[PDB]
């Protein structure tokens, strides 16, 4: 009912909400008794008013109650239940290999991911590049997998924080998106859904990242944290580097073959690795399967390097309806792009800068993602062999290998991948990888 | 387009708004083509940030130019065009004197007016218990009579202000109707679009103020003169109390009564006096009809006490098709209710407080008013002799004397009076029946 306009009315003048107050509201919009201009008028105010930790966990804990809540105590696990989550980035791809990591070390992983929002990518689109992958499993066969296994990566419902569907959609076209605790409540409401002991946060700092400052993504990241362990979850955050591709390659087949290079000690990017082994840890030790970061370190390691991650990826592969041979021929299923050739810059020099936004639109355009919510993907177009930054460039250093549908598109990207990244004559700052760790 | 969610981010960072945005937007509003959370959302960014004066100017213009807007120029009329308007109250039937009496000083009063919402009752509402009253003549019935009578009452024979409508439910409903500069733009611009060289505004103060507080109530008079004279109309506006019903009875058939009665000089309510008085020398004074406030008096003194208002009153009923001996005769064609019988407080004391709201809602409780538009008034019921704050009430004397349809409609109203009215030991202090008079 109409209490709506006067809990618009309350927060309006300057009044925190309280958590029946906060719940009603929530579930007005998922049962559509509210409507969109109740909503915007709510969002509206919370941008200038803004919230106070109370109201910060009473808005994301009734968005999460608003739909489904998972719950495994009822499977008597060995182990805790963990997650990382990421606000995303071009060639950010960890969670390929941390599942399995976490998971060959215990943990039990029910990641349940989205698809890729602009020029970042989305997990379930590089994962729709294995032929025969089911993100959409029956929640029984789920719970199988997560036993079995000990981590699956799957999509939506539609069961999920439902809320967030008619709120976020209003913030969209209102002007309210920007707003940290409504950003912090979006984030981290279907996460915690999934009935987590612990919860690490990646919250990228530069170009490519979703916050257009430093001082903006550790506030993120704060309000995160902070809200999280209000929720009964152990949560911890990383700040980490988006000024360049996390990864050696950006698109999706091409991000797949990556992570079961880096699982099975094919190829490991160095600052890839960097981001992936920090998530990682903040897993382990939110989770009480390490005393510390050291013995954290040193069980993820082994587990990497022996080849037990990479059996628990082909494993969830398998299981998930994907090829039982996967980690031994990806090179076989995947697709690869009728185009595929490097591309120079026009000087020599070190590689300065690049515009971690402006590759990964590049890759949007390529067909490696969607503007649309509708638009199809081609899985295979992308960039591999990418420079990074303080790199020597000249004429035998190619900036990158571009991966096409065709010449006419391959020239175009080629454009955007000399545009994007800056070349100078000395080798630049150089930069951490992982910047702050950040507690309760 | 959504680049309306442009204009919103825009004010919501703190600029001024252009004409050519704020047209935009108003017209968006009218034509469909912005949907209602954009509405709420930059309502909301007007509630914060408020407005500048030619902000507030192409608010006003741009709703009044959404519509129609009335010509008088091409009639040569010899006097002004000059209206009153008033944010409304239980018991003001001012409209019905003050233009026949306006009207017989020589200066044109097309007063087009709406139906009642809420506890205020319309005064095309009260005209309707007129037999056959006419409140839609067409074009050129309206032109005739005003040239022949002088004044006229009617609904909107036309679209005035089309864009109102979403702009205005959206706001009842999102907490945003309490923003001036949106106020200002509602009221004003159907009367804008009047066609008027002269304008006096009735903005009442106390219980039975639209606006929360009576230094909100100054605001809103002082923004409402402002605009109207930067939209080219000679404006004033009077704070004028209501703490009380203003006439001596509320209804329709009952206030119109007693509006006739004032006219042929029957009865008098000193306070109805009072104000009725003021907003004419207004009028007179904006419409230069005269030269100052004792001049004024003077000539309204003499058409009240020599009957030429009265007269002027039975023409434009007549005019209007109710009966054309009405002003002698009216208790013949005014439809008695079906039982009268005075009302008793349960205490002995002074009135201290009277709830003009709660007053209004017992009159639409009792079939007097319309929750919905798609209503049967019935025009006979409500409230006479009306007790005054400072009175003192015994076993003797009614707080009112109640017209209801039925006993079980007569003891739900007698209830909502008691309601209506506190007693206590000591007689409040009394209050101006004006408080100000803005002007420049
Ligand atoms: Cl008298």
Redesign the interface.
Same mark, same amino acid.
């Given at each position: 009912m *109409?209490l +709506? =306009? %006067?809990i618009? #009315?309350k927060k #309006?003048d300057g009044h925190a909400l309280s958590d029946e107050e906060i719940r009603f509201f929530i579930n007005g919009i998922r049962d559509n008794t509210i409507? %969109?201009? =109740? /909503? +915007? $008028?709510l $969002?509206? @105010?919370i *941008? *200038?008013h803004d919230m106070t930790m109370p109201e910060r966990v009473s808005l994301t804990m009734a968005m999460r109650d608003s739909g489904t809540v998972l719950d495994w105590k009822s499977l008597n696990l060995n182990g805790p239940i963990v997650d990382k989550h990421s606000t995303g980035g071009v060639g950010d791809v960890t969670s390929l290999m941390l599942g399995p990591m976490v998971a060959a070390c215990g943990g039990y992983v029910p990641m349940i991911s989205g698809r890729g929002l602009g020029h970042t990518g989305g997990t379930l689109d590089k994962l729709e590049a294995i032929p025969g992958f089911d993100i959409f499993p029956d929640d029984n066969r789920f719970r199988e997998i997560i036993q079995d296994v000990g981590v699956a990566i799957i999509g939506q419902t539609s069961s999920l924080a439902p809320a967030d569907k008619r709120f976020y959609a @209003?913030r969209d /076209? @209102? +002007? @309210?998106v920007d707003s940290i605790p409504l950003i912090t409540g979006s984030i981290l409401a279907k996460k915690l859904a999934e009935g987590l002991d612990a919860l690490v946060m990646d919250v990228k700092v530069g170009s490519g990242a979703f916050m257009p400052t430093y001082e903006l993504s550790e506030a993120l990241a704060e309000a995160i944290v902070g809200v999280a362990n209000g929720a009964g979850v152990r949560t911890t955050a990383l700040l980490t580097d988006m000024n360049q591709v996390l990864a050696s390659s950006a698109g999706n087949a091409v991000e797949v073959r990556e992570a079961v290079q880096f699982l099975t000690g094919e190829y490991r990017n160095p600052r890839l690795f960097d981001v992936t082994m920090a998530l990682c840890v903040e897993m382990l030790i939110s989770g009480q399967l390490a005393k510390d970061d050291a013995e954290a370190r040193a069980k993820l390691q082994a587990v990497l390097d022996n080849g037990k991650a990479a059996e628990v990826f082909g494993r969830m592969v398998a299981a998930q309806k994907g090829p039982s041979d996967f980690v031994e021929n990806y090179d076989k299923y995947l697709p690869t792009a009728m185009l595929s050739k490097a591309v120079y810059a026009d000087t020599e020099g070190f590689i300065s800068a690049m515009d971690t936004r402006a590759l990964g639109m590049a890759v949007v355009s390529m067909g490696g993602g969607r503007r649309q919510a509708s638009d199809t993907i081609d899985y295979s177009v992308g960039f591999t062999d990418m420079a990074r930054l303080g790199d020597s460039i000249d004429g035998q250093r190619p900036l990158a290998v571009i991966h096409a549908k065709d010449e006419a598109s391959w020239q175009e990207a080629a454009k955007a991948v000399k545009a994007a990244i800056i070349l100078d004559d000395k080798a630049p700052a150089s930069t951490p990888s992982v910047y702050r760790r950040i507690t309760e």
């Open positions: *109409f +709506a =306009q %006067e618009i #009315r #309006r409507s %969109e201009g =109740q /909503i +915007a $008028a $969002a509206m @105010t *941008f *200038f @209003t /076209i @209102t +002007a @309210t």
